Write a protein that binds this ligand. Structure first.
Ligand code: GTP
Ligand code: GDP
Ligand code: MG
Lengths: 432, 427, 52, 87
């Protein structure tokens, strides 16, 4: 039976895990202690002998504090004590710490736990990995774990949900280094990536949800909504059930092109929802507006390559069809020459549930979009500009060389992502 | 005696297949338990064409349900007619195809086809005189377009004489729900042409047009679409099941309908489509059927027959009627629309009559048509195929499976050669 | 469809023929996912004609 | 914060259930992003655990480890011996 394994690494990974596992327990109806007081429920929660279910996730962080918070929270009796792994010292915004000297102490322990989890599961659909490019742990440990995971399981899909550093705001200063040098792992040992920044979701929450002062949990609930919308087709029934492999094939044209764009709709509050009538046409029109991307880039300056639409609830194929036809009859939205058909529709029946104290209103229907498109080339163009502007003066390099990595890989990484954006320009070229 | 084996693959074929077994269980009067609760004798005389005898007055469908993912097998088991299907008839895989034609046809379908071949051989040996095989699947999936089109290659080698027809679901150009869709179809059409006696190309778009206009339902779900496909599935085989004034079978039309084994693609239609609101106000005669079935808006495929020439036409009538204006209206449509027929085949209309009506309707009719306009749909795939292929996009999924590059070229060469010689038969 | 708009003819024609959710179901699509009962076999309570 | 959100389920009795307008502050006046609940703080058994861990130190606990390790067992905890040979 289909099973997905969660690989949450870093402080961000642990927090998104908190939100997503809260939503999973709620939607399946699981008590926080671990008891059950159509749906599949086996894909995430695994039975034990005493009639108690244990989540299929691994939380790894090189600082013990954030994991200890969950160890002393409400869900202390839900996660397996072996599942959550800690380190005494962190990487502290250093790829070299996260990759070359600190990770190797606990790599084998993490791999043993993952091996046990894979032996418990029968049919593993794939590995969903949550991390961030900025953090030392979230970059380095994810990179080494992914490169070992690739040789351990050659055919298992390895999906990434990653927090990209924002275009303007930053929680640190040395992050362009780590975001640049995690690209080799995320380019060759990956299948699809789901880069998000915090700035765009800040804007979307301020603008539509009316919460003027969002905090991190306001983002984490939205990310949990994203992942539940993704895996609803594994969880429940529907007319058109879709799978991880289904959308990997319908979303990756070339091996170097595996960075779709995340988008969610409708994202509004109760006062909005009570008087605004939500139709499939309106939600699909909102999901295409550039003011509704999770990442800071305008698709109007890029070109769409492929789209996965995931509808859920009281959704009807005919109004989906009218929505898609209306979307296609637009000069403003553009598609490449070699993709005459570029939509994959998946349908689920169970409407999205609501976390108490949340922000989204109770909606009958929901949609999610995963858009592989070329407008994200500018994001790494800005990243390359800032990386060169700092590396030209050899700033902060002594930390890395002292931790024990060599310096030619700096230029190697810069050349790598320059080649990436060159290939994206190649694809953006049209054969007219 | 004259038995029919229904092959069932993929999310598509499993759903309409369950829908098809729902319709014919109603007509023959079986409850979902398995007992015969019909009234007439003629309901139960030739039940053994689809149904296999079981102890205790039970009847089991003689169908083989396959899917590379186990989720649908729980769903069909959880349907209305869910318990009627034999647990051994469920053969299922753990990993889905990913809309990948290559994965279902060579990678993982290879290990499972022996399990499907096992049950079919026992299925074949159970019936005394099998009339042929029947398969419902999707040309745009990964299982039916993939592994299913592989099963066709094996059984045809195993059973040459028997007649097999595919109630396949073609993609529409106006609406699609898969980016890699032209890859599997172009890799599917190359296989059906080689070994298939006649093919009923079903379009999902025209069905939505039908329920919007002809039936004017506000929210027809997929189940209604499967019913109209299920209606056609029973309509073709009715003269086999029941007595008629002039009977027919799957060979009586397949022999009568194809002048050349290459030209085997068909366009199936259903006659009595009237809205629920004005059922009591409807008049039911031969003329209004003929005006209904030959209209292009009634059609279930995405080609306008006015843009092509009708080569051959087969129509099977359901309902106790007599033949005189049944024969006369076929002449009226022939001489009036003389331009829309080809001239080297005189009297190109084939009629067949069965005595029994369906439940709740005194009359039915099913139209099976070979037209030039079916060639237009194939060119629409090639225009989509070449544009994606010229950039070699989405190809490493197929490349990384051990496939070569030339199979994309030969399949393109085949159907281009098909529409080349199909076009010369228009002129 | 008490309001007269957008196929209110058919809506009021089958106002009660289709609307029977027994207060547990909260979605007509989920209730009628299998297919609409009242289609092409109106008053479906007539057996086969025994006349040959 | 984690205790406020995940442990407490945002349990703020003083906060109103819904939001309304404010006139001059052109906003929706209630806002859960500020005005936390400041109830009894984040607590659990660790206080008493540490209190016992250091209270059970200064005792005149002369005794052999044998006698402090092997007491008289309850008659309730004896084995029931379900599976046995004779009738
Ligand atoms: N959306 C979101 N982003 C987060 C969250 N927590 C951390 N981040 C991101 O994570 C980045 C910093 O990495 P951290 O997780 O704090 O540190 P680390 O990954 O463990 O690496 P080290 O600091 O070396 O231990 C910041 O730039 C944030 O953008 C969160 O709860 N939600
Ligand atoms: N008409 C009709 N089409 C269906 C039904 N179920 C699925 N489909 C079509 O099947 C296609 C997807 O098939 P898929 O599951 O990928 O087939 P598989 O990969 O071979 O198992 C979609 O484009 C749907 O339009 C149905 O019940 N009726
Ligand atoms: Mg950290």
């Amino acid at each position: 039976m289909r099973e997905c394994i969660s690989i949450h690494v870093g402080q961000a990974g642990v927090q998104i895990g908190n939100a997503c596992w809260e939503l999973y327990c709620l939607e399946h109806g699981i008590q926080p202690d671990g008891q059950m007081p159509d749906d599949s429920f086996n894909t995430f929660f695994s039975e034990t002998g005493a009639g108690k279910h244990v989540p299929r996730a691994v939380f790894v962080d090189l600082e013990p504090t954030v994991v200890d918070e969950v160890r002393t929270g409400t869900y202390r009796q839900l996660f397996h004590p072996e599942q959550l792994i800690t380190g005494k010292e962190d990487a502290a915004n250093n790829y070299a710490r996260g990759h070359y000297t600190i990770g190797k102490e606990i790599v084998d322990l993490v791999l043993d736990r993952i091996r046990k989890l894979a032996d418990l599961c029968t049919g593993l659909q794939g590995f969903l990995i949550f991390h961030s490019f900025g953090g030392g742990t979230g970059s380095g440990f994810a990179s080494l774990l992914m490169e070992r995971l690739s040789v351990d399981y050659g055919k298992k899909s390895k999906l990434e949900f990653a927090i990209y550093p924002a275009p303007q705001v930053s929680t640190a200063v040395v992050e362009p280094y780590n975001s640049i040098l995690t690209t080799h792992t995320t380019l060759e040992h990956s299948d699809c990536a789901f880069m998000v920044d915090n700035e765009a979701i800040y804007d979307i929450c301020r603008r539509n949800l009316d919460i003027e002062r969002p905090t991190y949990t306001n983002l984490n609930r939205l990310i949990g909504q994203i992942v539940s919308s993704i895996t609803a087709s594994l969880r429940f029934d529907g007319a058109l059930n879709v799978d991880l492999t289904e959308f990997q094939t319908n979303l990756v044209p070339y091996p170097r092109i595996h960075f779709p764009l995340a988008t969610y709709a409708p994202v509004i509050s109760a006062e909005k929802a009570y008087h605004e009538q939500l139709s499939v046409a309106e939600i699909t029109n909102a999901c295409f507006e550039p003011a509704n991307q999770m990442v800071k880039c305008d698709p109007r300056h890029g070109k769409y390559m492929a789209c996965c639409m995931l509808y859920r609830g009281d959704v009807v194929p005919k109004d989906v069809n009218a929505a898609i036809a209306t979307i296609k009859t637009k000069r403003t939205i553009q598609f490449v020459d070699w993709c005459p058909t570029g939509f994959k529709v998946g349908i689920n029946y169970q409407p999205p549930t609501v976390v108490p104290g949340g922000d989204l209103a109770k909606v009958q229907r929901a949609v999610c979009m995963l858009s592989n498109t070329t407008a994200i080339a500018e994001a790494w163009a800005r990243l390359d500009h800032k990386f060169d502007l700092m590396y030209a003066k050899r700033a902060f390099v002594h930390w890395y060389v002292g931790e024990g990595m060599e310096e030619g890989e700096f230029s190697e990484a810069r050349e790598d992502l320059a080649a990436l954006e060159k290939d994206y320009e190649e694809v953006g070229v049209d054969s007219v | 005696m004259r038995e029919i084996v229904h092959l069932q693959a993929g999310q598509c074929g499993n759903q309409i297949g369950a829908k098809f077994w729902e319709v014919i269980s109603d007509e023959h009067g079986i409850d979902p338990t398995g007992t015969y609760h019909g009234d007439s004798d003629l309901q139960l005389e030739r039940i053994n064409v689809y149904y296999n005898e079981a102890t205790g007055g039970k009847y089991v469908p003689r169908a083989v349900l396959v899917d590379l993912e186990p989720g649908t097998m729980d769903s069909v088991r959880s349907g209305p007619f869910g318990q009627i299907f034999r647990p051994d008839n469920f053969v299922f895989g753990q990993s889905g195809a990913g809309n990948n034609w290559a994965k279902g046809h060579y990678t993982e379908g290879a290990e499972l086809v022996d399990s499907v071949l096992d049950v079919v051989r026992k299925e074949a040996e159970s019936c005394d005189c099998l009339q042929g095989f029947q398969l419902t699947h999707s040309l745009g999936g990964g299982t039916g377009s993939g592994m299913g089109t592989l099963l066709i290659s094996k059984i045809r080698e195993e059973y040459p004489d028997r007649i097999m027809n595919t109630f396949s679901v073609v993609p529409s150009p106006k609406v699609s729900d898969t980016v890699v869709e032209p890859y599997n179809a172009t890799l599917s059409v190359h296989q059906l042409v080689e070994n298939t006696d006649e093919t009923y190309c079903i379009d999902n778009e025209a069905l939505y047009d039908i329920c919007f206009r002809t039936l004017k339902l506000t929210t027809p779900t997929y189940g209604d679409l499967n019913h109209l496909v299920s209606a056609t599935m029973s309509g073709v085989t009715t003269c086999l099941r029941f007595p008629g004034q002039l009977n027919a079978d799957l060979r009586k039309l397949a022999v009568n309908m194809v002048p050349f084994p290459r030209l085997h693609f068909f366009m199936p239609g259903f006659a009595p489509l009237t809205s629920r609101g004005s059922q009591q106000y409807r008049a039911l005669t031969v003329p209004e059927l003929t005006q209904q079935m030959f209209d292009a808006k009634n059609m279930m495929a995405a080609c306008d027959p006015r843009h092509g020439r009708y080569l051959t036409v087969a129509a099977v009538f359901r309902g106790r009627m007599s033949m005189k204006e049944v024969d006369e209206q076929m002449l009226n449509v022939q001489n009036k629309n003389s331009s829309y027929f080809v001239e080297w085949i005189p009297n190109n209309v084939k009629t067949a009559v069965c005595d029994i009506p369906p439940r709740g309707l005194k009359m039915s009719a099913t139209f099976i048509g070979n037209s030039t306009a079916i060639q237009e749909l194939f060119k629409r795939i090639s225009e989509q195929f070449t544009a994606m292929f010229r950039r070699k996009a989405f190809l490493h999924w197929y490349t990384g499976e051990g496939m070569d590059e030339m199979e994309f070229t030969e399949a393109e060469s085949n159907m281009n050669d098909l529409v080349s010689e199909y076009q010369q038969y228009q002129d | 469809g008490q309001c007269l708009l957008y196929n209110w003819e058919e809506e009021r024609a089958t106002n009660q023929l289709d609307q029977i959710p027994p207060l547990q179901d909260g979605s007509e699509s989920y209730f009628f996912r299998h297919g609409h009962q009242g289609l092409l076999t109106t008053q479906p309570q007539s057996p086969m004609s025994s006349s040959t | 914060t984690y205790d406020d959100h995940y442990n407490r389920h945002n349990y703020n009795p003083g906060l109103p259930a819904l939001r309304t307008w404010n006139g001059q502050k052109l906003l929706w006046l209630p806002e859960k992003s500020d005005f936390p609940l400041v109830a009894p703080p984040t607590n659990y058994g660790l206080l008493e655990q540490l209190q016992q861990k250091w209270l059970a130190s200064k005792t005149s606990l002369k005794e052999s480890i044998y006698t402090t390790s092997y007491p008289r067992l309850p008659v309730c905890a004896m084995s029931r011996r379900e599976h046995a040979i004779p009738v």
